[PDB]
Amino acid sequence: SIDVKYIGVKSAYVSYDVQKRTIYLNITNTLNITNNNYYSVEVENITAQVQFSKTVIGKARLNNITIIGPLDMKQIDYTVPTVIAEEMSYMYDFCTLISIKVHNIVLMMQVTVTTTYFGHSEQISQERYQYVDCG
């Protein structure tokens, strides 16, 4: 993961952020640039060789080699009564982003209950922009 970037307003290799009142003139700004990037990553050469009970040559009664489980998860239990029992909102809004009593859930799961798993996984997750940009 080479560039996990979080630039705030903006990114740029070569920028001229000139943004208030600036009489500027007769500039030469010669720019030779050689920005080579090389990426030679994640060269897996693996030989797992994953094996159960290779050679029971004779008479070996085997039993219960791999008991995974039993198991529960029960991950998300809000259990939120919220018995206000007198609501008088009287809610005057102006140009406000306003989230009320919302349940934003992003449950991303992968590679669950898999005996074996080679190679690789990847879970990216962007989040909301939500730009009012009011007057």
Ligand X SMILES: *[C@@H]1O[C@H](CO)[C@@H](O)[C@H](O)[C@H]1NC(C)=O
- The footprint of ligand X (CB under 6 A) covers 25-26, 32, 34, 45, 63-64, 67
- Distance of closest approach, residue 45 Cβ to ligand X, in angstroms: 4
Nearer to ligand X, 25 or 124 (CB): 25
Q: Is the peptide bond before 81 cis (omega within 30 degrees of 0)?
A: no
Nearest to ligand X of 25, 106 (CB atom) = 25
Residue closest to 35 by CA, chosen among 12, 51, 60: 12
Size of the site for a second copy (CB under 8 A): 135
- Contacts with 120 (C-beta within 8 Å, 6 or more apart), sequence order: 42
130: left (phi over 0), alpha (psi -120 to 50) or beta: left
Nearer to ligand X (CB atom), residue 49 or residue 96: 49
Residues 97-116 binding a second copy (CB under 8 A) are 97-116
Q: How far is the CB of 47 from ligand X (least distance, A)?
A: 7
Taking CB under 8 A as the rule, which mask of x and - marks residues 49-88 in contact with a second copy?
A: xxxxxxxxxxxxxxxxxxxxxxxxxxxxxxxxxxxxxxxx
Q: Residues near 106 by Cβ (< 8 Å), separated by ≥ 6?
A: 125
Partner interacting with residue 30 (select from a second copy, ligand X, none; CB below 5-8 Å by kind): a second copy
Could you give the CA distance from residue 106 to residue 125 in angstroms, rounded to a whole number? 9
The angle at the Cα of 70, spanning 67 to 72, to the nearest 5 degrees, equals 145
The minimum distance between CB 95 and a second copy, in angstroms, equals 5
